[PDB]
Design a protein around this ligand. Structure first.
Ligand SMILES: C[C@@H](O)[C@H](NC(=O)c1ccc(C#Cc2ccc(CN3CCOCC3)cc2)cc1)C(=O)NO
Ligand SMILES: [Zn+2]
Length: 298
């Protein structure tokens, strides 16, 4: 039986939210089989829970933000979600005492590290995977995103920035997803902002926690960060990280192929919901033979 995974230990990190700029403590706790991924605002009385569900994602392109009927929020969950997806975590309580997940270094790597420190516990219940049986595609203008059948998890992401700082040959990345390949190739890729966009968002009271320590900053002509990039193609890798985290809002690892061009948080969420809404396009599956399981998590 391929088993559900949670943490062995409670772990904690403190940081600041990228957009709120608020100091926040993140606490991640083990949880029982069939619990799922739950996010909690613990600064409110009573505390407020959110599930990992595509429908709890706020209507915005800025980030992936959880919101409830009362407009209580947990902003910027995409990078932490990518780490959870990457290590195949099924059950976990994620607590924050402020309206945003800390940005840390802008990548998913700090979350990978914390999850590894917390240890992985395999539980006595079958891990369910969401397996694609048909192809589903969504579009927004020139943007598009697709999920199709594939025995594993393949991602193919293309960006098209027409920016002097981002060479044309570095704008596509393809990945056969495993915990190993995610951690090694994707997890360290940092978020980025263009100055034009940063100014726009700053003007609107956003990016309050933005800094060179948490983001690649690109001006009109070049990356401004002194020591450059972690990868020559760090930008497209980060867009892939975002997609991994966004798709994980359903709380299951997917078996299929994700292919996308300029897809951001809104379109990734649109795709997820479009898949879920077409019953014929997917199914939940479980496995018994470890030696042939489609996805490898360590
Ligand atoms: C695009 C996707 O990658 C997405 N990211 C974002 O949209 C996103 C990222 C970062 C930021 C930022 C920032 C920022 C950095 C540094 C400074 C301080 N400097 C002072 C001197 O002048 C230069 C500025 C102020 C602000 C804004 C927006 C994401 O990854 N979503 O998941
Ligand atoms: Zn991101």
């Amino acid at each position: 039986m391929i088993k559900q995974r949670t943490l062995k230990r409670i772990v904690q990190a403190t940081g600041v939210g990228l957009h709120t700029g608020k100091k926040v403590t993140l606490t991640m706790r083990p949880a029982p089989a069939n619990t799922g991924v739950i996010y909690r605002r613990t600064d409110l009385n009573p505390p407020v829970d959110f599930p990992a569900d595509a429908k709890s994602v706020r209507d915005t392109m800025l980030c992936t933000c959880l919101v409830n009927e009362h407009d209580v929020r947990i902003s910027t969950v995409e990078h932490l979600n990518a780490a959870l997806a990457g290590l195949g975590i099924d059950n976990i309580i994620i607590e924050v005492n402020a309206p945003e997940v800390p940005i840390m270094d802008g990548s998913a790597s700090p979350f990978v590290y914390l999850l590894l420190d917390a240890g992985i516990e395999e539980l006595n219940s079958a891990k369910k995977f969401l397996r694609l049986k048909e192809t589903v595609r969504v579009e927004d203008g020139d943007k598009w995103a697709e999920l199709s059948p594939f025995n594993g998890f393949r991602l193919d992401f293309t960006i098209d920035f027409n920016h002097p700082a981002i060479d044309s040959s570095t704008q596509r990345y393809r990945l056969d997803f495993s915990a190993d390949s995610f951690v090694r190739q994707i997890s360290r890729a940092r978020t980025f902002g263009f100055m034009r966009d940063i100014e726009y968002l700053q003007s609107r009271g956003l990016c309050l926690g933005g800094s060179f320590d948490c983001a690649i900053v690109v001006d009109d002509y070049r990356v401004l960060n002194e020591d450059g990039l972690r990868f020559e193609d760090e930008f497209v890798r980060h867009k892939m990280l975002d997609a991994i985290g966004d798709l994980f809002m359903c709380g299951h690892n997917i078996i299929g192929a994700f292919t996308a061009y300029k897809s951001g948080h809104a379109l990734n969420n649109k795709l997820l919901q479009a898949v879920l809404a077409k019953q014929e396009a997917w199914e939940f599956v479980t496995f018994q033979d470890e030696a042939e399981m489609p996805l490898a998590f360590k």
